[PDB]
Amino acid sequence: ARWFPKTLPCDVTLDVSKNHVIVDCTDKHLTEIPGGIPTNTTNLTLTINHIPDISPASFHRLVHLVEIDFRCNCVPIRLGSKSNMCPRRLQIKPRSFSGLTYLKSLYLDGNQLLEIPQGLPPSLQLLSLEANNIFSIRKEQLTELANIEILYLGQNCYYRNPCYVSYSIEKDAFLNLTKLKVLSLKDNNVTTVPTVLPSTLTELYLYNNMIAEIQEDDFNNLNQLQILDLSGNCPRCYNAPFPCTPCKNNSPLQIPVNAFDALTELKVLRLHSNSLQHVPPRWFKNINNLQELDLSQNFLAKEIGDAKFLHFLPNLIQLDLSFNFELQVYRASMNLSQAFSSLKSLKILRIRGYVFKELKSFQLSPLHNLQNLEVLDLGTNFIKIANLSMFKQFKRLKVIDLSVNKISPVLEQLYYFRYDKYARSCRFSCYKYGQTLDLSKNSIFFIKSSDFQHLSFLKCLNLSGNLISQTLNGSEFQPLAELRYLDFSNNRLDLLHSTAFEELRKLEVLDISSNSHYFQSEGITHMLNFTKNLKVLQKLMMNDNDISSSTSRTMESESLRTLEFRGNHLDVLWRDGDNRYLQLFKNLLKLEELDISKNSLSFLPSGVFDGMPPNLKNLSLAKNGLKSFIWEKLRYLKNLETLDLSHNQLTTVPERLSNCSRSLKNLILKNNQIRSLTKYFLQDAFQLRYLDLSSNKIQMIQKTSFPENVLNNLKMLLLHHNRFLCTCDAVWFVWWVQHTEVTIPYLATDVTCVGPGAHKGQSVISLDLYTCEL
Amino acid sequence: ARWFPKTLPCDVTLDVSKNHVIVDCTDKHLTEIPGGIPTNTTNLTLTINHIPDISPASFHRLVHLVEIDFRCNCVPIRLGSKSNMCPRRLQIKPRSFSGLTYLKSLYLDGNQLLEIPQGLPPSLQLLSLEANNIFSIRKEQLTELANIEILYLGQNCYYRNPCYVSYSIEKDAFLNLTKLKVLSLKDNNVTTVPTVLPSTLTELYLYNNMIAEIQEDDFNNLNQLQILDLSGNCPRCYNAPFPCTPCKNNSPLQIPVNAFDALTELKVLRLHSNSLQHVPPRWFKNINNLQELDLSQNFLAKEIGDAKFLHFLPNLIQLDLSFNFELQVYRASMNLSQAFSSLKSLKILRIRGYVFKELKSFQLSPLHNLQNLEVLDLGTNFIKIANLSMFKQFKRLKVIDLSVNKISPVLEQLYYFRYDKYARSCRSCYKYGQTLDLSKNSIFFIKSSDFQHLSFLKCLNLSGNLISQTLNGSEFQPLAELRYLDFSNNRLDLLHSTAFEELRKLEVLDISSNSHYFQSEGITHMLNFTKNLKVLQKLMMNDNDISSSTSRTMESESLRTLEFRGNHLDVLWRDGDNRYLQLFKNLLKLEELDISKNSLSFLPSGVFDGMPPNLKNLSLAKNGLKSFIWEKLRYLKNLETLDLSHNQLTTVPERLSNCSRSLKNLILKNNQIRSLTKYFLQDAFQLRYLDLSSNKIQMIQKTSFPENVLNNLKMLLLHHNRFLCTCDAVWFVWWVQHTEVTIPYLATDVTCVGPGAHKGQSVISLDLYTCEL
RNA sequence: AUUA
RNA sequence: UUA
């Protein structure tokens, strides 16, 4: 169905609306720009390769190029591969770009360059040079960038990529860049705010540098500035997980009280890790539009209790005051100044790392009438005592986050303590349910109904990762009449009573995963038929519980649709000869998705499929060490659409898959030991739409196994990483792969000959087999 | 160095003292008995193969055989592999054994046999027929076994291997076996004690059967019986993890009170899981030698508070009363009868699964004067309250076991609840002194007062509790002699570097799986807490997810072993951050360092220089190491063991001599090594163990493997490679065939991948004569 | 899990 | 392989 097979090792794509032809050669182990790129190419990406040089021949025929992404073909020593270090800088020969008359965006990050490349076309609006070795900016080297609007020069001199001197910027270096909207000089060992900057600036990024003082007039003209980030000049270095040098004498970044006067358009101000001890109200006299303010990682512990500056910020949406605690101090309580009540627009307030023993309801009173408040984040505060009923005055909130505290009777895992949370890479929850009380990672070991008094409004409660080691009998959550999602994972649930959780009469999702403790000790009673009582439960997760025994023999539900039962011991419950648990899931009448991967099921006893509930659609048996599989038994599963058998030990496929399942749509067989396909494998498998045979040991595929009326249905067909043998016997397969319309990922990189000798390591897509036709 | 290569796929071994020639073909995927077994062979083992038949030709020349182990060549369907089910029972032709005039032991278990193989020699003393399909014993079929002493007939009819009828035994079938010492009829669907039995019996095993009643005289003559197991007749089925059918009418196994009268020599009596509700003293009137008595898995809850029968047991060493609780009852406390005080000889007492809320010192008083008591096991009792100071009255004990309870302010994991704990297969801190095992409880806070009066303790097990606390050294004051502290699986918060410093006798500390507080950014961790513990030998901090540390050095002048696996040294040693490159340098006496599973895809320069000076055994396994500067091994001047298994290395050093000139054991299994450097092992004279298995090597030439270096080797592992058996391979193939050096799996996984002709062929059998024409 |  |  293809007259000319695609041989270029890049994903080519057409967006005819925007007349873009996209050529993506990301990470193709290329040592030169591959030949045969479409001359109509607009966007060409060549990141993560080892192309040693660029020359006029590089883009010679590609005169329609709007964007060139040529990053990380020589990433600096400490940043890149240690197995494949780049030997020498990328070389850009003269005139390599001057011919690309339409080029608007040029990325040359991560190539160890020493200087701003010259000869760039005046069409250019974005130039990116992060992670190079350019640490001295001269106004002459910038003349060529007249029409530039976006300029990234950061990460060219910092601990992971040192230049061993200060960053140097000539006076007015940037001033004649009259269209410059975004200037990024982060992570560069800069020592003063470069001046004068063009008043066209909208975004200025100066963070993680060596700037100790702001001059009064450093931002005098930037009356279009919207984002200003000065974070990490004079850093707070306590528990920093990267090398950190503070300003002498514990000095803060010194900011004159009038330094922001010109910034009437400022929407974002970031002063993270600037070791500040005061926030002068004078700063915000002529900024009335500020929406986002980060003051995390300073020394504002006392200022939080005063905080007059908040009276000047009526339009503020986000305020972050996290990690301002005084060292070695465990405060008794949280002193929140009354000034917080003047933050009429506040949607998000974050005060992690204040560190205090006891939170009591009045202390949050400055917040009571903040009508727009959606998120209150008091995590990582070592709170020991908290009456949860105080949040009855915060029903309007979407998330109350008390994660990581010591209470007893989304942001990244590493966020406040990383070096550059916004660093670019070489390539490129229950909040939905309503009000959420996150109590995860606390010290709750016993819960009683009263603990939730006055919180009937809660829709999701996260008790994950506490110490609850208790038999729940339905009396513990009584007030939570509207709860839809309970995350109870990483506790020590003791399912003695089949009335556990039955008081949560609106519960749709229940996670009791990683509660393996009591299931790990022999002879203890576990009631798995507790599902009968939850009449609107859709989804149950009981993964990684080590379940090997069960007092009850069947689980019952008239509502349950998804059961995650992964990481347990169904091999033990279904031990050959023991018939008592073969219908464990049969009475989950509405169940459509069953995950019983990672259950040590090296074989499936007869009765397992007959015992499945009648509407099972999607079944995972992955990661089981399955050594054998009687495919005929799929006939029992009359609504089976997806079968995941990945990461097992299967060595054969069924003789005729049609004769096994008349419903099967998605068959996943990846990472098995299959060495050949049956003669008529896919014959009349008219329902088949997705087939993954990748990561096996297949040598040959004949036409009988792959009828073309079945292959034209297939949305995807995975074959990479097999042991394909490219003799003349393989002529049909090699022809078909090269000429097929079917989607086959990784033809450029992992559909390969193992032999014979002559062809080893060669791609099947490039194979020439004419010698078989003489 | 060998003139005739061994080609037999069996390990041949000679113990000339007992003039035994042992030939072990266990699990060699054999479909016939290999030819060429040494004629002098004594023990021949052929278990786990697929030999379909035995015939007179089988052992024709092997007339010196004392033992034949021929088990599991046709395992019953539900017991064996389901990927390779045996298609048809093993077939034993007439005369197969009559010629083996010296044959004393014959194992034919797990072969799906239907009948007792006949024609056995009169020399035979042990016959084993477990896991076959023999469920009818006839006295006629037993004549040939005149001189037999050990006879195993169990597992021929049970849930995993059903026969669908009752087991049948003709009367006096065993009586003329005048030398018969041990008879095992376990797991057999037996319905009465077979009679009469030969009085020569010492061990009789009838457990897991369908015996509903013992007759008065069933054991009348067995006055040499030493062990009797009747367990699992009328079983207690509550929470049984196997199919379990109780005796009707909630009846127990009925034993008339005089049934044991003849059993004067009985040392062990096992009545586990017989649904008993009473233990009549009359049973034990004429046994005073009893040492071991199992009464677990009955219904003796009340009888434990009465227990008159114990007065008849002054010689008893072990007593097990575990899992007698009455269903649905959570007693307030443990009523132990005073009769326990009469167990003058008792060393081990076990009462798991009594199930009661509060244990207090008075309940244990009957135990106060049992001077020989060594073990008290009160686990799985759901105890909520226990003043631990009550054990001040038990300093003499070796183990006080409160594992798996609900306390708050070794036996196999499955033991009391398995079907047959003694079934045959087809093939700790106690040492340190008094041990208080509190593992798997609900302790969430520790204060010094909790250990008042327990200074005698040597090992304290707190593993698997809920301790989520900063220890400042004030929590363990009374434990002045503690040598072993297991604190794993808790939530230790190392805020204070004075943690544990009060335990000034601590030699080993496990704080593994205390990852909780290490998982959350910005929290202070003091890893230099080791400085205060002046006698600490072994520190385990495995699986803690440590990625950050306020302190930059760990300090100890005593510590010799540090387990640091499952952490994030990749983050602490992030390229460009030099501050933790000497984390371990001042562990001056450290000899063993485990930093496997640390995501170290590379080792930054400085890591090796930062190692302490006496490092002997260093594991970098399971790290995804893609690259390794072998030269930097020069810094490690005392390195004896280097474990680099399960990584992504593609090369070995150009000269291992020039890298480490002490290295004895180099482990490189499961990597991506495709070829050896030309002069690899040249002059590496101290090397004694080399594992290159599970790599992708195609060729090995003599340059890389000089023979003055390979004869050094205690072992040399090469299996699961990609060996190419062309004429280029002539030296390697010759050396493998003729070497004395031990190379495991030569029979089964040292294989040519090619070329074509030789694909899948064993290197040991390879004929390369065409290369010499 | 090739007698658990 | 800019975190």
Ligand SMILES: *[C@@H]1O[C@H](CO)[C@@H](O[C@@H]2O[C@H](CO)[C@@H](O)[C@H](O)[C@H]2NC(C)=O)[C@H](O)[C@H]1NC(C)=O
């Ligand atoms: C950032 O700038 C500082 C000073 O401008 C550099 O520090 C010097 O580094 C050299 C070489 O390591 C030392 O010999 C000097 O003592 C340092 N001078 C001062 C004043 O500290 C630093 O190396 C620069 N580069 C970075 C941090 O990557």
Ligand SMILES: *[C@@H]1O[C@H](CO)[C@@H](O[C@@H]2O[C@H](CO)[C@@H](O)[C@H](O)[C@H]2NC(C)=O)[C@H](O)[C@H]1NC(C)=O
């Ligand atoms: C070789 O076979 C003999 C005979 O089966 C084994 O010797 C027996 O070992 C037990 C162990 O205590 C003794 O009770 C028997 O009396 C021995 N038989 C005798 C002495 O005739 C021997 O263990 C086997 N050796 C190996 C290595 O398999």
Ligand SMILES: *[C@@H]1O[C@H](CO)[C@@H](O[C@@H]2O[C@H](CO)[C@@H](O)[C@H](O)[C@H]2NC(C)=O)[C@H](O)[C@H]1NC(C)=O
């Ligand atoms: C143990 O023996 C009993 C007989 O007492 C077997 O039970 C019979 O099994 C067949 C087939 O399942 C039934 O049709 C009979 O009705 C049963 N008879 C009785 C009296 O129950 C039992 O199967 C045997 N057990 C094993 C494991 O072989």
Ligand SMILES: CCCCc1nc2c(N)nc3ccccc3c2n1Cc1ccc(CN)cc1
């Ligand atoms: C974000 C705070 C980082 C420093 C820190 N680390 C810890 C820690 N591991 N455990 C604690 C436990 C209770 C209170 C505070 C801390 C604490 N703290 C805060 C703190 C530490 C020490 C002191 C002095 N006792 C007061 C407060």
Ligand SMILES: CCCCc1nc2c(N)nc3ccccc3c2n1Cc1ccc(CN)cc1
């Ligand atoms: C050896 C024990 C097997 C049965 C069992 N299972 C559990 C369990 N999962 N949690 C408990 C928690 C507290 C007390 C008893 C049990 C218990 N128990 C004992 C028990 C169960 C049920 C009752 C009835 N209230 C009393 C006592």
Ligand SMILES: *[C@@H]1O[C@H](CO)[C@@H](O)[C@H](O)[C@H]1NC(C)=O
């Ligand atoms: C293509 O490049 C243009 C110009 O830089 C850019 O605006 C657009 O987002 C790119 N599109 C794709 C799909 O790469």
Ligand SMILES: *[C@@H]1O[C@H](CO)[C@@H](O)[C@H](O)[C@H]1NC(C)=O
């Ligand atoms: C909070 O602290 C500020 C100064 O830090 C002080 O003005 C105020 O009175 C304090 N309020 C309370 C309730 O402690």
Ligand SMILES: *[C@@H]1O[C@H](CO)[C@@H](O)[C@H](O)[C@H]1NC(C)=O
């Ligand atoms: C918690 O506060 C609520 C009122 O919001 C009150 O009803 C309850 O008694 C308090 N509980 C405790 C333990 O202080």
Ligand SMILES: *[C@@H]1O[C@H](CO)[C@@H](O)[C@H](O)[C@H]1NC(C)=O
């Ligand atoms: C609950 O919190 C844990 C840890 O904070 C998190 O992993 C989990 O995804 C949360 N649950 C939901 C339902 O968001």
Ligand SMILES: *[C@@H]1O[C@H](CO)[C@@H](O)[C@H](O)[C@H]1NC(C)=O
């Ligand atoms: C459930 O347990 C709670 C607390 O242990 C108790 O108050 C309540 O009476 C129990 N309910 C039932 C039905 O047993």
Ligand SMILES: *[C@@H]1O[C@H](CO)[C@@H](O)[C@H](O)[C@H]1NC(C)=O
């Ligand atoms: C669960 O099963 C047990 C019997 O195994 C029964 O006692 C209990 O009442 C059942 N509970 C429910 C809710 O079905």
Ligand SMILES: *[C@@H]1O[C@H](CO)[C@@H](O)[C@H](O)[C@H]1NC(C)=O
């Ligand atoms: C089937 O379920 C798995 C979860 O086990 C999910 O990841 C997958 O996308 C599902 N497939 C379909 C077609 O619903």
Ligand SMILES: *[C@@H]1O[C@H](CO)[C@@H](O)[C@H](O)[C@H]1NC(C)=O
């Ligand atoms: C498979 O083929 C047989 C032979 O005709 C047919 O009777 C049977 O119904 C088929 N099974 C399915 C599931 O189509």
Ligand SMILES: *[C@@H]1O[C@H](CO)[C@@H](O)[C@H](O)[C@H]1NC(C)=O
């Ligand atoms: C402590 O108890 C745990 C849990 O029972 C056990 O795994 C561990 O081996 C024990 N520690 C020692 C040192 O014996």
Ligand SMILES: *[C@@H]1O[C@H](CO)[C@@H](O)[C@H](O)[C@H]1NC(C)=O
């Ligand atoms: C350690 O802390 C405990 C717990 O509060 C306290 O009892 C003790 O005074 C402290 N000891 C030292 C030496 O700091």
Ligand SMILES: *[C@@H]1O[C@H](CO)[C@@H](O)[C@H](O)[C@H]1NC(C)=O
């Ligand atoms: C551990 O090191 C830290 C330095 O980060 C220091 O504060 C503390 O006193 C040290 N303690 C010991 C016992 O070495």
